[PDB]
Write a protein that binds this DNA or RNA. Structure first.
Ligand SMILES: [Mg+2]
Ligand SMILES: [Mg+2]
Ligand SMILES: [Mg+2]
Ligand SMILES: [Mg+2]
Ligand SMILES: [Mg+2]
Ligand SMILES: [Mg+2]
Ligand SMILES: [Mg+2]
Ligand SMILES: [Mg+2]
Ligand SMILES: [Mg+2]
Ligand SMILES: [Mg+2]
Ligand SMILES: [Mg+2]
Ligand SMILES: [Mg+2]
Ligand SMILES: [Mg+2]
Ligand SMILES: [Mg+2]
Lengths: 97, 226, 42, 127, 62, 25
RNA sequence: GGUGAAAUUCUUGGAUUUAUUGAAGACUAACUACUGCGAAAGCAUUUGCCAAGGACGUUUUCAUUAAUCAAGAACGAAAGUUAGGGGAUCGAAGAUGAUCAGAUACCGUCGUAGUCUUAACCAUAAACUAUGCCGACUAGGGAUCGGGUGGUGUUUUUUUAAUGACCCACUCGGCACCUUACGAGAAAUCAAAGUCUUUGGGUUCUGGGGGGAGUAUGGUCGCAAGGCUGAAACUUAAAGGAAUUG
């Protein structure tokens, strides 16, 4: 039967979506079906901040960040400890934790 | 993986740093700091002419280092060597850029990105490509959560920005443009001329790149140093 | 988050610089917070 | 008082490159990668091989005259993985202990305006 | 032959598939108040003192 | 069999029968 | 370099890496969303030109010109065909390294046709909302897109105007969504899959157990690949849908 109302995706009035490639396996997945995430970390790992503070030439230096947007396919997201599987009543829950 | 090269030579030790010696970099006078850093070349032999070896180098430096203040922390500046005189080589402006973290911090969703570029030539026949960026902003008292523009506001904003950038360039030779970009005064009348259309936050304009240059005219560069 | 950030550098404690070399050092980079008159008389 | 170079850490998978060039970048000092410190062919991108390589770049920078350095971290970029390898934070940490001075950390990963095509086919890397 | 002594201050948990390796964080006696995370083969308790051939290590779970 | 590869198999069979019949005609 | 691990491959003729340029072709990131436009397939850089379109507003005009439609017509992803151009990537075939009992597969490295464009074909798709179009009525809730109306509402310009951008209320049209089931259904579920044994709003197309079979044959279109139309002999008592417990 029909598992989902939107069937996998966010295509309502769109016809075509012009897909993207998964960051883990280069699988072509439509952009509405993708499981887009944003990974925003510091330029420096948290165990090196005090290390880098005493080695910096500057009194006040703002640590920059990496802002990288990730697109996963369904197979790679479930395998990589992401959205993997929810119960039928919890499938309809659209709110992030 | 040392023991992995099957062959090191298809057909079948002198340390170069003793040969190497140091120079120093001089910023133009439209910058609060002249001392940028030091470079290495080989010894000036009679057949390789070390002055020509370091003649066309491009040095990457930050504007916060050039001005001391940390407010212009992103704002990267290209400096191009042109004229060398006894371990005291001089540099001229080659371009300006943003850091990748500052650009990606600005680009957020549920707002509209507006980009404008021009290809206007200055008074010294410098041809520059100047890029601009802006973002629509959520006004105070606003309830709804995205604040998008209406694609004719964008075309009205883009026309306003492109006419401003092409106006401030003709009238500025090069040093007036560098002394206009440093105070970030260009971002001001973009905001003033676009507040009629849309709120438009975050107008730290964008990079500017050089395209073509005229002849040398070494009196101009010694006006920047001397 | 997008808005949060951290600051590293020399200012991640203020102390009296007894040595004049420390005074010459501290003025050189530029970390001097105050110069106060001594409590006692000369 | 400080002589400044550019660190240029290529933090990929399968390898890690550290080499300190001049401010202009034309003259290069102390290029030792991670593959020349471990004999596995598997852990050329490990944090150990990265930090052993970053200890060598600072030894050859101190004996040349470099005291400080700017850091440009880098992933593979282009159409490829675009995230830093495991050796990026190890190499950056290792040359901070060694005596070098750090300023202006930055990423220089080549990010396209969605260039040509990823490899692997439209069905992916099937493993 | 440089060796470095470190004191276990907080035990993080077990690691390894068979469970034989313990994640601990340690405090160095010399160069006080800078701490890293290591792995211990044997039974490690609070106020155990470790000696390390190298101190340039972070601990990743096995 | 997959219905795609039975469709492929009969398409190849029709091509053989089309060309073994053009011998006579 | 690649990988779970390696190997093929490139390297002291300087590989990988750094800098400065140049050339080529493709693509149009981040913004980018239960958002927009189009009959659908589809369409995401700027600007100029060309012609079109929907919704809204209207105390403008015509006056039943309408709805669905055999025959017939236009458009129609990708792949494929023909002829020029282009040919950077990726890559049906092919070549190689690995794994394997085998591996002419998955994985690695190369790599033709193709991928792009121009002129002409093809006429398919899980071409899907697996849900024909037009019309009416039936339960609540907020959001949002386009237009309009009102409000001494907030902000900015030139404190101040008009505007613009927001705020509140209303309205027409649109992509949808949340709750419930009066109602439907075999159930999954459904504001239509409701107003259907208390069975008639109008109209088009299609199906009649499973195979054999979308096969044979004959037409017809197509350069071809193929598309459209399309049986019978024979065989069979189950195939199949949705839920339950293991
Ligand atoms: Mg199923
Ligand atoms: Mg479709
Ligand atoms: Mg080279
Ligand atoms: Mg774009
Ligand atoms: Mg839109
Ligand atoms: Mg069909
Ligand atoms: Mg159908
Ligand atoms: Mg109806
Ligand atoms: Mg409205
Ligand atoms: Mg509405
Ligand atoms: Mg809509
Ligand atoms: Mg029947
Ligand atoms: Mg039948
Ligand atoms: Mg079933």
């Amino acid at each position: 039967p029909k598992k989902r109302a939107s069937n996998g995706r966010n295509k309502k009035g769109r016809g075509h979506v012009k897909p993207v490639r998964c960051v883990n396996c280069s699988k072509s997945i439509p952009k509405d079906k993708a499981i887009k995430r944003m990974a925003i970390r510091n330029i420096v790992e948290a165990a090196a901040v005090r290390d880098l503070s005493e080695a910096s030439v500057y009194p006040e230096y703002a640590l920059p960040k990496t802002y990288n947007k990730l697109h996963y396919c369904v197979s790679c997201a479930i395998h990589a400890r992401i959205v993997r599987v929810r119960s039928r009543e919890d499938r309809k829950n659209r709110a992030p934790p | 993986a040392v023991g992995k090269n099957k062959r090191l030579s298809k057909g079948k030790v002198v340390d170069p740093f003793t040969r190497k010696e140091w120079f120093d970099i001089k910023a133009p006078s439209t910058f609060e700091n002249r001392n940028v850093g030091k470079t290495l070349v080989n010894k000036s032999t009679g057949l390789k002419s070390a002055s020509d070896a370091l003649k066309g180098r491009v040095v990457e430096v930050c504007l916060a280092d050039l001005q001391g203040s940390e407010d212009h922390s992103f704002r990267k500046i290209k400096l191009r060597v042109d004229e060398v005189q006894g371990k005291n080589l001089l540099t001229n402006f080659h371009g300006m850029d943003f850091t990748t973290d500052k650009l990606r911090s600005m680009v957020r969703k549920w707002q509209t990105l507006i980009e404008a570029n021009v290809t206007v030539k200055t008074s010294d026949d410098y041809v520059l490509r100047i890029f601009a960026i802006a973002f629509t902003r959520k006004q105070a008292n606003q309830v709804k959560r995205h604040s998008y523009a209406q694609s004719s506001h964008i075309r009205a904003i883009r026309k306003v920005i492109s006419e401003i950038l092409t106006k401030e360039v003709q009238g500025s030779t090069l040093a007036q443009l560098t002394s206009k970009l440093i105070p970030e005064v260009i971002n001001k009348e973009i905001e003033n001329a676009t507040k009629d259309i849309f709120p438009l936050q975050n107008i730290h304009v964008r990079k500017v790149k050089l395209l073509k240059q005229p002849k040398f005219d070494v009196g101009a560069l010694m006006a920047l140093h001397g | 988050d997008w808005d949060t950030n951290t600051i590293i550098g020399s200012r991640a404690r203020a102390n009296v610089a007894r040595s004049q070399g420390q005074i010459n050092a501290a003025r050189r980079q530029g970390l001097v917070v105050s110069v106060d008159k001594k409590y006692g008389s000369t | 008082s400080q002589v400044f170079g550019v660190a240029r850490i290529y933090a990929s998978f399968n390898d890690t490159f550290v080499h300190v060039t001049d401010l202009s970048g034309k003259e290069t000092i102390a290029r030792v990668t991670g593959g020349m410190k471990v004999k596995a062919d598997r852990d050329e991108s490990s944090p150990y091989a990265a930090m052993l390589a970053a200890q060598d770049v600072a030894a050859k920078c101190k004996e040349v005259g470099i005291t400080a350095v700017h850091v440009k971290i880098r992933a593979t970029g282009g159409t490829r993985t675009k995230t830093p390898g495991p050796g990026g934070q190890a190499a950056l940490r290792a040359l901070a202990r060694s005596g070098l001075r750090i300023g202006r950390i930055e990423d220089v990963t080549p990010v396209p305006s969605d260039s040509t095509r990823k490899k692997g086919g439209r069905r992916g890397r099937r493993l | 032959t440089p060796v470095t002594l470190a004191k276990v201050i907080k035990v993080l948990g077990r690691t390894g598939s068979r469970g034989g390796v313990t994640q601990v964080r340690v405090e160095f006696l010399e160069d006080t108040s800078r701490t890293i995370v290591r792995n211990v083969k044997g039974p490690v308790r609070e106020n155990d003192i470790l000696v390390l051939m190298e101190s340039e290590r972070e601990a990743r779970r096995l | 069999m997959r219905a795609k590869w039975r469709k492929k198999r009969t398409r190849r069979l029709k091509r053989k029968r089309r060309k073994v019949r053009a011998r006579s005609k």
